[PDB]
């Protein structure tokens, strides 16, 4: 990796675009727990039948699997076999989390967390 | 005595375990940086050649 | 009682341990409801069909009874007919709480309270 580029080109150094997470003022609750799959940052997380931290996905099998009850929001990534500090309470952004498809709109993203300490609202 | 005895207390015996610094004696320099990372450069210059 | 001792002997006054209960920084919510059975100190409580405070025991039914959900954590002991001031919020110890059998490992003791304000984490 050593060639001093002699040409003439425009380019960007980067583009910073801040990721505000909190949409309210309620209290935050945290815990570390053992992972079962590969988790990104701020991805919604359930618990499988063994007690790991599998990332959240509805429609998992007839009978709903325990991967459908979403529980937490991650804070740092981990491989399968590391333990994950994850959030349990607060008020978080509608668009900073990593969801997946078929869970697009605001009504479904709040219907995931209608009951918990975690609440999801709109930034202004 | 009677209902219950009296007591003279002596000093508190405090078993206290420490872990003294044996390995830190080779780490003299302290750097309190506010930035993110710490860059090093190592250069090896092979001159002993015919 | 009546005679003092003149002789020489020894004894232990006894021993004392701390029992730590809290493990985090959630808000704490309390309530006193009337109890249905004897409850020890720091025992997990359910609510039966009559609205009383039966101490929690799962596998109670082909539909499970409303004792199968756990709600509170007691703070002072009370017999049947007395009311029990229990906890609804906070973060509590894994080991100081009075569980019972078949609920022994770590993962079950959090899958009881995945959803509520109450969260049960390990002391370091």
| CATH at A113 | 2.40.300.10
Contact status, residue C54 vs residue C47, Cβ threshold 8 Å: yes
Q: Which of A47, A50, A117 sits opposite C117 (nearest CB)?
A: A117
For residue C51, the SS3 value is coil
Tokens standing for residue C100: 């019972």
Contact status, residue A112 vs residue A68, Cβ threshold 8 Å: no
Q: B3 CA to chain C: closest CA distance, Å? A: 6
Total domains present in chain C: 1
DSSP class of residue C31? E
State the method.
cryo-EM
- Find the helix or strand (DSSP H, E) in which C109 lies: helix C106-111
What is d(CA C19, CA C17) in angstroms, rounded to the nearest whole number? 6
With CA atoms as reference, the chain C residue closest to A90 would be: C26
DSSP class of residue B25? G
What does the H/E/C string look like for A76-92? CCECECEEEEEEEEEEE
What is d(CA C75, CA C42) in angstroms, rounded to the nearest whole number? 5
What is d(CA A107, CA C20) in angstroms, rounded to the nearest whole number? 41
What is d(CA A79, CA A40) in angstroms, rounded to the nearest whole number? 9
What is d(CA A21, CA A44) in angstroms, rounded to the nearest whole number? 13
Q: Please report whether residue C112 resides in a domain.
A: yes
Considering only CB atoms, which chain B residues are within 8 Å of C5?
A: 1
**H runs (alpha helix) in A6-121:** 106-111
What is d(CA A122, CA A20) in angstroms, rounded to the nearest whole number? 11
Q: Please report whether residue A68 resides in a domain.
A: yes
Handedness of CA A101, A107, A111, A112 (dihedral sign): positive
Task: List Cα–Cα distances, A121 to A72, C16, C24, in angstroms.
Answer: 16, 49, 25
What range defines the domain where residue A66 resides?
Answer: 29-121
Q: Please report whether residue C107 resides in a domain.
A: yes
β C30-34/C119-120 pair status: unpaired
Contact status, residue A46 vs residue A57, Cβ threshold 8 Å: yes
Q: Please report whether residue C1 resides in a domain.
A: no
Q: Please report whether residue A96 resides in a domain.
A: yes
Q: Please report whether residue C8 resides in a domain.
A: no
E-strand ranges in A10-63 read 29-34, 44-46, 54-55
Q: C66 CA to chain A: closest CA distance, Å? A: 18
Experimental structure resolution, Å: 3.8
Task: List Cα–Cα distances, A73 to A67, B25, C113, in angstroms.
Answer: 14, 42, 17
Q: B2 CA to chain C: closest CA distance, Å? A: 5
Contact status, residue C93 vs residue C23, Cβ threshold 8 Å: yes
Task: List Cα–Cα distances, A29 to A87, B43, C24, C90, in angstroms.
Answer: 6, 48, 8, 10
Q: A67-105 burial, b for 16+ CB within 10 Å, e for fewer?
A: bebbbbbbeeebeeeeebebbbbbbbbeebbebeeeeee
DSSP class of residue C65? P
- Of A63, A32, A40, A37, the closest CA to residue A48 belongs to A37
- Find the helix or strand (DSSP H, E) in which C110 lies: helix C106-111
Q: Which of C27, C106, C115 sits opposite A27 (nearest CB)?
A: C27
Q: Please report whether residue C20 resides in a domain.
A: no
């Amino acid at each position: 990796t050593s060639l001093p580029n002699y040409l003439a080109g425009n380019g960007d150094l980067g583009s910073w675009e801040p990721t505000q997470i909190f949409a309210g003022e309620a209290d935050i609750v945290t815990e570390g727990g053992a992972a079962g799959a590969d988790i990104e940052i701020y991805q919604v997380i359930a618990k499988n039948a063994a007690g790991a931290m599998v990332p959240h996905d509805p429609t998992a099998t007839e009978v709903p699997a325990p991967q459908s009850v979403a529980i937490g929001i991650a804070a740092q990534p981990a491989k399968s076999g590391q333990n994950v500090p994850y959030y349990i309470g607060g008020v978080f952004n509608h668009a900073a989390l990593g969801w997946h498809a078929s869970l697009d709109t605001l009504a479904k993203r709040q219907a995931v967390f209608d009951r918990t300490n975690i609440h999801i609202g709109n930034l202004y | 005595a009677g209902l219950y005895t009296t007591y003279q207390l002596l000093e508190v015996q405090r078993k206290l375990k420490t872990l003294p610094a044996f390995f830190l004696q080779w780490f003299p320099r302290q750097i309190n940086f506010q930035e993110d990372m710490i860059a090093f450069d190592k250069v090896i210059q092979d001159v002993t050649r015919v």
